[PDB]
């Protein structure tokens, strides 16, 4: 039990992955609010 | 609000960031305006939704 504590204190990639994927998708969603898709601008004003 | 071209909506608040003395407004990651500089008094103000 004393070695678990060292090996961690010094591995949680499966938890870090989930977080990264969700953030990478939420950023791609917002970065699409600045494309024209074939219009004169990206702003309704 | 309209700051010499920047058109937007939101609450304006006194800031504590420091632009460089040629930068007008600040942007976030994902590219949304979140700070401005008032042209007349030259102070930085945050823009919250
Ligand atoms: C724009 O004009 C206003 C006045 O019309 C300037 O305001 C002055 O600011 C100084 C601060 O350095 C004060 O001492 C003066 O009393 C202010 N004048 C008035 C009438 O309030 C303002 O500074 C100008 N913009 C810039 C960037 O200088």
UniProtKB/Swiss-Prot annotation, chain B:
What is the recorded name of this protein?
Spike protein S1
The full protein's residues present here are 541 to 589 of 1273
Query: Assembly and interactions?
Result: Binds to host ACE2. RBD also interacts with the N-linked glycan on 'Asn-90' of ACE2. Cleavage of S generates a polybasic C-terminal sequence on S1 that binds to host Neuropilin-1 (NRP1) and Neuropilin-2 (NRP2) receptors. Interacts with host integrin alpha-5/beta-1 (ITGA5:ITGB1) and with ACE2 in complex with integrin alpha-5/beta-1 (ITGA5:ITGB1). May interact via cytoplasmic c-terminus with M protein. May interact (via N-terminus) with host bilirubin and biliverdin, thereby preventing antibody binding to the SARS-CoV-2 spike NTD via an allosteric mechanism.
Q: What does this protein do?
A: Attaches the virion to the cell membrane by interacting with host receptor, initiating the infection. The major receptor is host ACE2. When S2/S2' has been cleaved, binding to the receptor triggers direct fusion at the cell membrane. When S2/S2' has not been cleaved, binding to the receptor results in internalization of the virus by endocytosis using host TFRC and GRM2 and leading to fusion of the virion membrane with the host endosomal membrane. Alternatively, may use NRP1/NRP2 and integrin as entry receptors.
Taxonomy, superkingdom: Viruses
